[PDB]
Ligand binder design. Structure first.
Ligand code: NA
Ligand code: NA
Lengths: 347, 347
């Protein structure tokens, strides 16, 4: 029914067909797992996966769409017959200008229509299979975080904590989902990863990590104390945890993403941290680490059952320290389920 | 003098200015190391790095170009005054259609000109500083390969060899430059990394790896025997090594890239492997793992001193095994220098 829903979405967008080039959307539509080397045409006649003959067996095993096996430009030249006379959308935030020129030459009797975000709303609600995959990725992340966290102590390099997490994710058959952040002391205030800095007694340490497993992602963030933090950084931590648990507890179908953001910013302001926080509270997670919906104050997104999102308030005191705490949340029919189960400690 | 050369290149391309969006070319032009978050305008008035105020200090420390500090769209709106009346090239293989539309709106009195490969020839010849950086990356790769290679023996998973290489690269302050290949037995024939397969007595094992360090890349490939290979796979290995050393020995300023490719394909044919080899012999390496020049049979590239390229014949017997051997080569004023120093073994 994802494909059942897409052609009406295309009609609402004013097009008859869609050339799908973003790798995550090629994979979402077809099941093909080397999607950088595939493209999909959705048309009034059906939907076809285009990929080359190095992928013949893989694509036959994986793809829920019929395959046309060729290299570019034979793929979209062959497609040209299907799109004669039509308005063909393409993904303007993905397709390069050179690729557009190539399609324009191949499809002289079509009108190419630049579209933005066309599949983003459909990707936001996950199927049961996708939720299972995300649970497995987050379970791997929780296992490795829980195994590694005891190593976080005075004298350890940030980089070495990241290396240990990455090693265990990869040995398990997954991978770190994005560049791992291990930020101690004043590095916890910085907007921009894991440096060679040695963790010091008294520091908070923020660990931002996720696993990619089976093409699906997870995402959590934890902050922990090494020794006894300053009273100030303890207040920051406790406020950020307060904000995170309050925003999570408001998740339900129909809540506006922007109203979740407002709840967290109001709480941080009340706790004297109202100019210290980041400007988005969270994002969807799935085939990409960052995807829809978006939880900014300007968001028009409305949560519904089946979405998977992060909730991540933070507060940063430049030159001093900072705290982020984040969980991965499934929206359910009548509330939420927290998927990230690693401990959240006191400090 | 790289910038001294670029404006004449633009003139030959028929444009007055260039909007540089590809991260490697932003970094190449400016020195800025978070180049996904910078853009460069080259214009008749000069060259400017555009980035946001989170990078103020970093960009002042790193950039050889003056900085205009803003977020998009203020960056290219501010630039609009500079490009009034001009033909402005952009990088058509990098810029998305949405980004082009954004520039078209901002620059209504300019003509936007789609260009391909504009900076690729200038990037191909490295400066002394860049050669130093590439040597350091390849030296790190050689150290880690040499440390890890003794672990390659019967009973070991391919994945575990890759994990060990990645762990050591990261702990040293670098990173694996691309998805590491450790391909044993019949996996050595496959076109498409490091699986959970257990290496078997009698297998050849192909290790394709590089380090990224300081923004510069390296690249080598080795094949080694575990135990005694079949006579057949020994013939394949010896032929591929013969081809690699012969092609390397023909490198000098003025040699045509396509003629190096022909030398290797003719040698593999003579050794009964003339339908088993890949269709490019090698590529440049620098800020990206794969960059110009290109060593295909159709290449028009001519090597010159200062280029850094791979030479990588291979031969694959599907269902059976395969061999690739690759070194990283600096073209010198009167020959070549092999930068990758790890042992090449007999089998
Ligand atoms: Na996170
Ligand atoms: Na290689």
């Amino acid at each position: 029914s994802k494909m059942d829903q897409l052609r009406p979405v295309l009609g609402r967008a004013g097009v008859d067909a869609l050339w799908v080039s973003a790798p995550a959307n090629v994979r979402w539509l077809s099941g093909f797992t080397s999607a950088e080397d595939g493209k999909v045409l959705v048309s009034p006649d059906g939907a076809t996966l285009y990929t080359d003959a190095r992928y013949t067996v893989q694509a036959q095993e994986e793809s829920s769409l019929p395959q046309y096996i060729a290299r570019p430009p034979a793929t979209y030249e062959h497609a040209a017959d299907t799109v004669r006379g039509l308005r063909v959308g393409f993904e303007a935030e993905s397709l390069t200008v050179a690729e557009l020129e190539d399609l324009r030459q191949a499809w002289p009797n079509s009108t190419l229509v630049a579209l933005r975000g066309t599949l983003g709303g459909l990707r936001a609600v996950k199927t049961p299979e996708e939720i299972g995959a995300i649970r497995a990725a987050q379970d791997l992340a929780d296992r490795v975080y829980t195994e590694v966290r005891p190593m976080i102590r005075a004298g350890v390099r940030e980089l070495d904590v990241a290396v240990e997490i990455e090693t265990r994710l990869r040995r398990a058959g997954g991978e770190s989902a994005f560049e791992l952040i291990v930020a101690s002391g004043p590095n916890g205030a910085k907007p921009h990863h894991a440096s060679k800095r040695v963790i010091e007694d008294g520091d908070l340490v923020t660990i931002d990590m996720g696993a990619r497993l089976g093409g699906y992602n997870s995402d959590m963030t934890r902050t922990v104390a090494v020794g006894t933090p300053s009273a100030e950084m303890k207040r920051v931590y406790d406020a950020v945890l307060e904000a995170e648990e309050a925003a999570i507890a408001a998740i339900r179908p129909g809540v506006r993403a922007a109203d979740l953001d407002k709840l967290a910013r109001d709480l941080l302001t009340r706790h004297g941290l109202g100019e210290a926080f980041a400007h988005s509270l969270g994002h969807g997670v799935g085939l990409e680490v960052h995807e829809g919906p978006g939880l900014r104050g300007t968001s028009q997104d409305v949560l519904e059952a089946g979405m998977v999102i992060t909730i991540e308030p933070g507060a940063y005191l430049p030159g001093v320290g900072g705290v982020r705490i984040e969980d991965l949340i499934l929206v359910t029919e009548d509330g939420y389920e927290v998927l990230s189960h690693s401990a959240k400690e006191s400090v």
